[PDB]
């Protein structure tokens, strides 16, 4: 079985950038390799077949070059339309084989995130069980820092997080934490705060509310 | 050349997986059509499964050789998948492809076609329906102009969940976020639209959940306080 | 240069002048033509002529693909090695930048390789582009496509008439300039060289097109060409006609005749003898021939052309008593053996008949002659240049007893036919 490196693991870039993604086969594979692009819930792409030919309907800044052992794939412009995660494959020996993949992101200006909380519906209470979702949204970049103090007290192991793919339209991210609780330890207690810490935040941020 | 699967989302351990593909635009033994199967564990790369010729020829890779199987059924223009005694190690994002060439003197490697995929768990588990609870905007889910609000899908099995705003009219500011898989065996995922706030009290904002492994739709009116 | 003796006293000629020019061995080179394959073909007078050529292009293929469901021992294993796994992208990576390339094959051979024809590089820029706008409107495109597939369809069909093996290495399989640098690449000295240059048309008939592999675009033949290990020794050819004894009565004759006919080659101090006709091809007085179907013989074999009663090597002859009449035609003249009543002459084209064969075995140079006549045969003599000598001398028919003369040896000699005549003596 070929083994197949990918270059890097991944990248950003600013629009408008050249971005390049070189590719490594175990040994010689001639021409047959082929390049996918693949986005968040949807079946790969293919973009570039047999090393350099152009697949219909991609546009003309993608470039295939490479013969042999060493390969690569070019972005002549990146765009936000390419906010995605690519693939070479190899096809001269069987079984066919992929590399790890490439994610690409977008590269823009700190963005600070928009901070909202949001209680227990009643309605949840009724089952037994308190979940509290404290939401970051649209912010730049990516890492960020969620922590639950409920009465001034760090809670751990109770909350799970979950971010959104860069969006496409700002090149920023979202993210939603949320904490859950039992309906009786949630009903001893009386506030419940989410601190914020993220590289467009001067200081960290906090948004709480009362009577739980 | 259109692709569409179908195949069961939730298989029993130690069972046989049965996936299907309905060619559309060239018939299943056309010339130099090679019908691919390939998979994608979660958070990971692809995986080639195998491929059946246009004349039947079916080559599967070394390591799934004992467990697979495929064939052709040209009356209804589509060809099959079988994998036996699966575990949990096959759960996957499983494609449906298609390689196809006017003149091919090489080996069939490129997937111009793709099917949507079936993503098939493997547990011993049950499915279960979601619980839709709504996330109500009030002050401290205001920011200036603009107020956000949502709905919390909470304990369902197995993924996926497909996620609405009033029923496809809302679409603007919506971000459905991915799963997390609980403590418990049960999935949760939410969904929150950034919505102007002088529109509360005068407009309806209704979260459409849709899981298909039980037959469920649950509509809930997101609404303040 | 080419010159001719006549031996009246063993009705047979020897004609010597001759250099030779032997096959010894085989040069196996690769001779590949890059393919391509073509995803996809979907679209107006001139881009449907187009459309007509990628279709024979397509249909070429094809039948390429079902062709692949000693002489060439040599050439087969070369085609053997080209189907393991990789082998054929080894020589598909030495001719990326190259026409011309050794290979070392996975089994250690080192094989000259040569791609004639690069149909993938000229579809891949020119015509892809254009098939996925269909607006084709010059006319010079369309030509260079027809000419180069023109090539493929007929190297196809050659080895789809020839069961994957030709012969002669047609101007198709290798031009006449790829076959002049092959050639010049050759591990040779410069006479070797020089001669294959100056007989490419003998070079071609003694050389094998073994069509092996068509995997991962890249079509390959295997050109068989042959070695000439054995250049510039002295070769004669052998002519041989019946010897019979002159009675008046019917059926009481004798009849002797001189057998292994044919070519005789000096050879690292033995003569090769090439027993069937046509392996050996004359062009001018260099005689190219093929040693595999030859035997190896003692030097001292030529001396039953001056001495064939010689003690030191058994002359091979055949006895008969029919005393039938016919001619032989030679390199510079015709031999003659006329007998019963038989009217036999030679003419010239305007001044007619020039000299009367009385019965016996007689001889005349092509000096003035042009045709021969044994009863109702005409033979026409060769016309080339070169002096012939007649060595006049007893026919040795006429040292045989006939009572016991051996008439039923076909393979035999003269001390075979001396023991069988003394055991036929010692009875009487």
């Known amino acids: 079985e070929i083994v197949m490196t990918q270059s890097p693991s991944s990248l950003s870039a600013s629009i408008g950038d050249r971005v390049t993604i070189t590719c490594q086969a175990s040994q010689d594979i001639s021409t047959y390799l082929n390049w996918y692009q693949q986005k968040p819930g949807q079946a790969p792409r293919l973009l570039i077949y047999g090393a350099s030919n152009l697949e219909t309907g991609v546009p003309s800044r993608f470039t295939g070059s490479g013969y042999g052992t060493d390969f690569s794939v070019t972005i002549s412009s990146l765009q936000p339309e390419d906010i995605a995660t690519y693939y070479c494959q190899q096809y001269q020996y069987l079984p066919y084989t992929f590399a790890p993949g490439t994610k690409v992101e977008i590269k823009r200006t700190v963005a600070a995130p928009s901070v909202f909380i949001f209680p227990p519906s009643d309605e949840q209470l009724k089952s037994g069980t308190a979940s509290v979702v404290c939401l970051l949204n649209n912010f730049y970049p990516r890492e960020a820092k969620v922590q639950w103090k409920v009465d001034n007290a760090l809670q751990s192991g109770n909350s799970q997080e979950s971010v959104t793919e860069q969006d496409s339209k700002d090149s920023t991210y979202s993210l939603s934490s949320t904490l859950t609780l039992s309906k009786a330890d949630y009903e001893k207690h009386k506030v419940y705060a989410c601190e914020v810490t993220h590289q467009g935040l001067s200081s960290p941020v906090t948004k709480s509310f009362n009577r739980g | 050349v259109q692709l569409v699967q179908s195949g069961p989302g939730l298989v029993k351990p130690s069972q046989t997986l049965a996936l299907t593909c309905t060619v559309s635009?060239?018939?299943?033994?056309?010339?130099?059509?090679?019908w691919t199967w390939i998979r994608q564990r979660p958070g990971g790369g692809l995986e080639w499964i195998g491929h059946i010729s246009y004349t039947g020829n079916t080559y599967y890779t070394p390591s799934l050789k004992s467990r697979l199987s495929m064939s052709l059924e040209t009356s209804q223009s589509q060809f099959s998948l079988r994998l036996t005694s699966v575990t949990a190690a096959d759960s996957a994002v499983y494609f449906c492809?298609?390689?196809?060439?006017?003149?091919?003197?090489?080996?069939?490697?490129?997937?111009?076609?793709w099917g949507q995929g079936t993503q098939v768990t493997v547990s011993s588990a049950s499915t279960k329906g979601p619980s839709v609870f709504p996330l109500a905007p009030s002050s401290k889910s205001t920011s200036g102009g603009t107020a956000a609000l949502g709905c919390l899908v909470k304990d369902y099995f197995p993924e996926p969940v497909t996620v609405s705003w009033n029923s496809g009219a809302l679409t603007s500011g919506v971000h459905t976020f991915p799963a997390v898989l609980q403590s418990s065996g049960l999935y949760s995922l939410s969904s929150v639209v950034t919505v102007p706030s002088s529109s509360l009290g005068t407009q309806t904002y209704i979260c459409n959940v849709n899981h298909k492994p039980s037959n469920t739709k649950v509509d809930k009116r997101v609404e303040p306080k | 240069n080419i010159t001719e003796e006549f031996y009246q006293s063993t009705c047979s000629a020897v004609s010597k002048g001759y250099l030779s020019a032997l096959r010894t061995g085989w040069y196996t080179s690769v001779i590949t033509i890059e393919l391509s394959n073509i995803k996809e073909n979907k679209c107006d007078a001139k881009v449907k002529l187009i459309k007509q050529e990628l279709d024979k292009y397509k249909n070429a293929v094809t039948e390429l693909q079902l062709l692949m469901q000693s002489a060439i021992a040599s050439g087969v294993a070369v085609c053997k090695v080209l189907h393991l796994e990789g082998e054929v992208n080894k020589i598909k990576s030495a001719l990326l930048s190259t026409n011309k390339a050794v290979v070392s094959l996975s089994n250690g051979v080192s094989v000259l390789t040569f791609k004639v024809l690069d149909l993938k590089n000229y579809i891949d820029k020119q015509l892809l582009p254009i098939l996925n706008s269909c607006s084709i409107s010059n006319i010079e495109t369309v030509i260079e496509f027809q000419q180069k597939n023109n090539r493929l369809l007929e190297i196809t069909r050659e080895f789809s008439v020839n069961a994957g093996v030709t012969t002669p290495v047609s101007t198709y399989m290798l031009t006449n300039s790829e076959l002049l640098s092959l050639i010049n690449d050759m591990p040779i000295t410069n006479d070797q060289k020089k001669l294959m240059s100056n007989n490419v048309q003998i070079v071609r008939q003694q050389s094998y097109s073994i069509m092996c592999i068509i995997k991962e675009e890249v079509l390959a033949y295997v050109v068989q060409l042959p070695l000439y290990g054995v250049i510039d020794t002295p070769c004669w050819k052998l002519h041989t006609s019946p010897l019979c004894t002159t009675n008046t009565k019917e059926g009481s004759n004798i009849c002797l005749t001189r057998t292994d006919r044919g070519w005789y080659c000096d050879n690292a101090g033995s003569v090769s003898f090439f027993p069937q006709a046509e392996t050996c091809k004359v062009q001018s007085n260099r005689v190219f021939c093929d040693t595999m179907n030859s035997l190896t013989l003692p030097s001292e074999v030529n001396l039953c052309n001056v001495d064939i009663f010689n003690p030191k090597y058994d002359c091979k002859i055949m006895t008969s008593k029919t005393d039938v009449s016919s001619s032989v035609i030679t390199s510079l003249g015709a031999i003659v053996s006329c007998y019963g009543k038989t009217k036999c002459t030679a003419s010239n084209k305007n001044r007619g008949i020039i000299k009367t064969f009385s019965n016996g075995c007689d001889y005349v140079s092509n000096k003035g002659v042009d045709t021969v006549s044994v009863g109702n045969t005409l033979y026409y003599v060769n016309k080339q240049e070169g002096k012939s000598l007649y060595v006049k001398g007893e026919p040795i028919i006429n040292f045989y007893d006939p009572l016991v003369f051996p008439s039923d040896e076909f393979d035999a000699s003269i001390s075979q036919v001396n023991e069988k005549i003394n055991q036929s003596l010692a009875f009487i």
């Open positions: 635009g060239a018939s299943i033994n056309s010339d130099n059509y090679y």
């Open positions: 492809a298609a390689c196809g060439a006017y003149v091919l003197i090489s080996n069939c490697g490129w997937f111009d076609s």
